[PDB]
């Protein structure tokens, strides 16, 4: 029984543009979702709170 | 009078509600009974 909020699949997607074994799969996917949420929480907090050159929008 | 065959709540956010529905079917069935009762009050029903 995986927690809800950890089901499905998630991944970070980074882009540059010129513009304006059954349970093993489930537990690996949920752990990957947890780590992607950890990454994006770190990134979004550093974007909002840390003062940097040419600021970002979250 | 009217029967309330299916009531559904369309308001959804998949983050505050932790990847699940915003309102459990228990509470939806409760509101089903409440609006069915106020339909049985037999006023102008659809405004209520």
């Amino acid at each position: 029984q995986i927690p809800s909020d950890l089901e499905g699949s998630a991944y970070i997607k980074v882009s540059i543009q010129k513009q304006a074994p059954h349970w093993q799969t489930k537990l690996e996917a949920a752990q990957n979702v947890l780590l992607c949420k950890e990454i994006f929480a770190q990134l979004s907090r550093e974007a909002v709170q840390i003062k940097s050159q040419v600021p970002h929008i979250v | 009078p009217w029967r309330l065959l299916k009531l559904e709540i369309l308001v959804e956010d998949k983050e505050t509600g932790d990847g699940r529905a915003l309102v459990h079917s228990m509470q939806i069935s409760f509101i089903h009974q409440l609006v069915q009762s106020r339909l049985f009050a037999d006023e102008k029903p659809l405004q209520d």
Side-chain angles (χ1 to χ4, degrees), chain A residues 16-32:
Chain A
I16 275 176
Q17 54 209 12
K18 306 205 71 157
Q19 197 264 324
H22 160 55
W23 31 264
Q24 182 65 256
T25 299
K26 278 200 193 174
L27 293 178
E28 279 170 308
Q31 195 176 19
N32 178 41

Side-chain angles (χ1 to χ4, degrees), chain B:
Chain B
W2 310 79
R3 274 182 64 215
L4 213 61
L5 293 177
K6 184 177 68 64
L7 175 137
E8 202 269 352
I9 281 145
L10 293 156
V11 165
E12 50 92 12
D13 166 90
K14 300 206 173 187
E15 292 86 351
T16 51
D18 41 22
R20 210 178 278 131
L22 260 289
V23 48
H24 197 198
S25 44
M26 166 64 55
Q27 302 106 19
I28 277 171
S29 48
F30 175 72
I31 300 154
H32 195 155
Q33 281 108 28
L34 199 140
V35 178
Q36 190 56 53
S37 89
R38 283 185 83 248
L39 284 173
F40 279 163
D42 290 6
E43 296 196 355
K44 30 189 197 177
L46 304 178
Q47 299 311 113
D48 306 319

Side-chain angles (χ1 to χ4, degrees), chain A:
Chain A
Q1 276 319 292
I2 303 168
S4 169
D5 110 328
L6 285 182
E7 74 274 27
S9 44
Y11 78 109
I12 311 285
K13 168 181 174 307
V14 182
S15 158
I16 275 176
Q17 54 209 12
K18 306 205 71 157
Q19 197 264 324
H22 160 55
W23 31 264
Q24 182 65 256
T25 299
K26 278 200 193 174
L27 293 178
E28 279 170 308
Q31 195 176 19
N32 178 41
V33 165
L34 194 57
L35 183 137
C36 296
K37 293 197 172 211
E38 216 282 336
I39 287 175
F40 198 81
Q42 194 69 231
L43 290 173
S44 84
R45 171 154 62 248
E46 289 164 11
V48 168
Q49 279 169 349
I50 291 299
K51 171 208 186 313
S52 157
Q53 182 182 3
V54 54
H56 329 285
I57 289 179
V58 184

